[PDB]
Amino acid sequence: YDGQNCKEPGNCWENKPGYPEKIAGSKYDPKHDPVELNKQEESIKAMDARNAKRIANAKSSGNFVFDVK
Amino acid sequence: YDGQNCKEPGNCWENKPGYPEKIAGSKYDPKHDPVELNKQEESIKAMDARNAKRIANAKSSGNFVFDVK
Amino acid sequence: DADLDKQVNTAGAWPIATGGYYSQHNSPLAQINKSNVKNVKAAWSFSTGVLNGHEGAPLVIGDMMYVHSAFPNNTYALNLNDPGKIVWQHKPKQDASTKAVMCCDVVDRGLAYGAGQIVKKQANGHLLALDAKTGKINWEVEVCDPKVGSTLTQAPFVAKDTVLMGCSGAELGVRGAVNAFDLKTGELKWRAFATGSDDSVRLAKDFNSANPHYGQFGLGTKTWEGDAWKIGGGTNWGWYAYDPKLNLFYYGSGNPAPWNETMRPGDNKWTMTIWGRDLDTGMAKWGYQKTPHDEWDFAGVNQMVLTDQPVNGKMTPLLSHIDRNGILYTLNRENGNLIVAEKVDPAVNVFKKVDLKTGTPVRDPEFATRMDHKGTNICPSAMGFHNQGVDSYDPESRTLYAGLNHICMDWEPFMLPYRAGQFFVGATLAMYPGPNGPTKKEMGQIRAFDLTTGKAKWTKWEKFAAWGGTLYTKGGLVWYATLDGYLKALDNKDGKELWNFKMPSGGIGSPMTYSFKGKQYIGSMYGVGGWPGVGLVFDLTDPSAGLGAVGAFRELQNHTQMGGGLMVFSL
Amino acid sequence: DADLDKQVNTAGAWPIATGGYYSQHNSPLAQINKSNVKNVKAAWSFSTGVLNGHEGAPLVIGDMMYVHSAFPNNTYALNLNDPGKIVWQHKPKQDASTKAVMCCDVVDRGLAYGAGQIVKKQANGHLLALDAKTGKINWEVEVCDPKVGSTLTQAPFVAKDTVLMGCSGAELGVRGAVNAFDLKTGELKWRAFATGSDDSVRLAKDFNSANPHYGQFGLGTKTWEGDAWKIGGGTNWGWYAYDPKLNLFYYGSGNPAPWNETMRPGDNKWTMTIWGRDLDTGMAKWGYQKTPHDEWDFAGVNQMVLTDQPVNGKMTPLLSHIDRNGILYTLNRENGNLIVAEKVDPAVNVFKKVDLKTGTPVRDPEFATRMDHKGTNICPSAMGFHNQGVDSYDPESRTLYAGLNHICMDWEPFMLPYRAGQFFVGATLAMYPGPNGPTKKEMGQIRAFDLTTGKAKWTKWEKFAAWGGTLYTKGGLVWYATLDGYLKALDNKDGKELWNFKMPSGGIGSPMTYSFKGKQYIGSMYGVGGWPGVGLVFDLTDPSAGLGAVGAFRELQNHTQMGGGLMVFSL
């Protein structure tokens, strides 16, 4: 694996000798939990909503309040 | 009470007008607990013993050790 | 915005952390020069009342200076007519737990300025705009969530009516993104992720049209197995650059997560990428991945320097950058064409070289990392041959003065699960000096480079890594702070040391300069910390602690102790 | 011992915190003078890596300097040939709870030296002797028990083969005592208590024979009701002086506990007393109680200055002292005769005057304190018109340059129980600027005095209290640090300010000076704290907090922030 053998432009990864092409089902399977993986997106969604509320209230009241509800 | 009326040399205290000559039994009685009052002396006694041991141990062994027992 | 431009065009002002939109971190102030630098002395000083690493440098707007500390991220406004009076201050209330999810000390790289406001963030993820004169909070919004391991450390970057802010946390599996906010209201305009769908990454229709071999669409997911990209790192916590004419801003995305390469097969795009994005839409015009499938934590967030120089006689709009991987890159900043890719030191062995035609590193298997194997004598180490330091460029001699690290390592990964809020590294390291120091013990270098050829002009060795960076002033001086506590000035022609002062503690930021009442001043933060100082800062003694950094920097605490403040110098 | 004497007699050395056995805190070094002080600049600096108040000043033995921090009481040894290298360091391991029983910030007033050892203590009560060259601990013993509210803050004092060390804690009812230890082994020789039986107080058979009206025997219990003396205060945490010829050491015992005067009727001897004790036996030759039955927390621990001057044309062996109560005292140091007792500022109203014949303050009932009454506009306040600052004496003009406080107060006591380990104050205060400042807001003064008459020669007002003290150098300069962060040099003739430098943080120690390779250096600690800085240091805002100190110094944080370090200056 010298990075010079590309299956597609911009995709040149190769498994190293003695290692699997796919880790799913192998001794290196990370077994990540789907719900756990989505935690960042879930957090951002809630955060974006809190900010939207602050922005909206600031525009209608003329004063910025971080803790508004 | 101007400090110039001394009952004895070096003892010039006087109770201020409206205050008692002795506070024991008065509404200003501190009611100190003898057990609490003696705590400093007790601690010093134990501390002095610990230091004595350190000093003795260092003298006999030639090396100073704080935690010796 | 227009107000920022006004300050940028004000002689002696310092409204941008990197020295200007092109981030050349230099100054035309020439009062202090080679002939009189020996007479420079301390003018005054200011303690932040905070310990830990004090990165970045203060800003100077008009006759006002703004100083910032490490966590809890305090801001102090001083009028230069009387540095003894704190005109206004902002001392944030943050949960102490915030520090627990910060990988590399509770550092803060600085403030930004725009529309008469000081733009400041907090480690806990808040971004605020404060009136520069009164300190009144105009707006305060959430950018990162520490509960999932996301924090803020980099300096915000203002361009037109936009504030660019990126979260940190790749060591905790945080999926990187450049978040853009309205300078006036704090409203989120958009965010460009480093991994995932093209829509989330925000790629223009003509993305990499000039270099299709760099890769174009669908790679944000195709170069990963399954949903591993969701916790794939790529955070951008370094520095930005901006070209007003092209309306493109530039920056580098960080390392993929975890450090265990075996747990994430694939090129892992678009982590470790140099970007050219439209400021208004955030859409990428071009993107070049420096390190496909990272195996060494060469977080590609280092400074982007824009310059216009002749390449073999032809004037070219350039972007230069020295990556953690030890490669000095120079690309055409308009289209992304790769022009230079040279090793900043011959010790670099992870790659035999970077192929200019294929556009990728020619990997050397002997120095790769992988499960069930301990890689040895790998250069550069994870700390890189260059880290968060901000370097300077002299436009006259056309030279970049780089603050480099000369540290290599041993590395072996191990399996571990991902749990939001917990670290997600998966590797044990040992770090030590590179092989080329004069006594083979030196870990720092100030090396001058021609950006059009990538060749070095001279080198000055330092006992410890040159972590903060360098500042270049027209008097022919290269200023920089050392981890052991000195502010120094070198003759830019040969690197000869001409002046130095022993500050209270090591410096991990880059020097800045400004003028006041007809006098040039040099300002430097002090207070050792950051990755190099974790051993000293957190009372660590295990050589493998701090991910190997503790052992490598074991001697630092015999030369310096913590601190936190600013020292200013002048004639 | 002989080794300390050798250093004392070494030109340019600084082996004693107070400047010498007589504690005149001066120096014959005259390289820096009135004509060239304007050219003094910073030479180098050193951060301790600790915040909170940094009291005291470093020691210089030969070509080595020893710097100390606030709690956890770290010691750093540097060779002046290379301030960048920490030759050795001692970092104590102490329970964080130690800080909870420290009344007035976690300060440390300095190190001592004797028999080739650096004598240092820790807030937790340990006293150690470390080899001056290697830092090796030769002995470590317990002196105070934090569990009963006793801690260590004052600098140890070495004389012959004895180390004098006093515990702090009167605000917690600690019964004061000067403890004496063997310089070579750390063994306890004896301890002289401030209250109790004459045996425990260690009074000589001819105690006060020259002034029987001061009081002699049996008063350590007779001037108290019952066992109240057991928790009667009298701690000595200030400074000492020593006269080798007379073999007498001098110091002042602190305030009686609690602050609530109604809870302890009686003169409360021997708290608030100026002592003259034999160094070998600790037996008091004489003792003068300055403030019988304290009602204002005028802890009588201030500096003792020994001088030989003509009084009415007659050369006399003197001891001078400016107490918290606002009275400047000058006594014959051989027998304790009272010569001078003058107000350092006319605002002093607790006493109409001190009667030289009766030897006691003529009390003014209008400004006394007592239960069920709020006293107002009382001067001085509990912070006193003089606190822990170390002043200087110019032997040529025979002038003492005093760092004073100009702060008064409102005070009302209240009943409270005593529980070993807990605070035992019992009073609520409001403190504010005295009535005589130019704008009635100034709280500090540098005032020159003739010690034989008690008359002032000149005054320089300071916004904040002159807490650290002053240093006098033969070049005709009065050096001092301010709470707002400046190191200043005044013309000793009129107090005219000739030079200043803005250090990182306010200074609460007194400057020191030394010579190294042909040059005179001035050293000053920086890092605001102590009682004046409690509001800033502990994030307090209630005006009544810090026992009134918070309200009085509310503006300090608008001029300085915390810090911790040393700054050195020279030509």
Ligand SMILES: O=C(O)c1cc(C(=O)O)c2c(n1)C(=O)C(=O)c1cc(C(=O)O)[nH]c1-2
């Ligand atoms: O992946 C990330 O998000 C992340 C964040 C940070 C940071 O923001 O301090 C560092 C790093 N990585 C790490 O790669 C690194 O080398 C580093 C050094 C420092 C520093 O300030 O000294 N921070 C960081």
Ligand SMILES: O=C(O)c1cc(C(=O)O)c2c(n1)C(=O)C(=O)c1cc(C(=O)O)[nH]c1-2
């Ligand atoms: O009664 C005592 O034992 C005691 C101890 C201390 C100390 O050791 O810091 C102070 C005081 N009292 C208090 O009276 C006082 O004014 C004071 C100021 C300071 C300071 O360092 O700023 N300490 C102390």
Ligand SMILES: [Ca+2]
């Ligand atoms: Ca990283």
Ligand SMILES: [Ca+2]
């Ligand atoms: Ca007291």
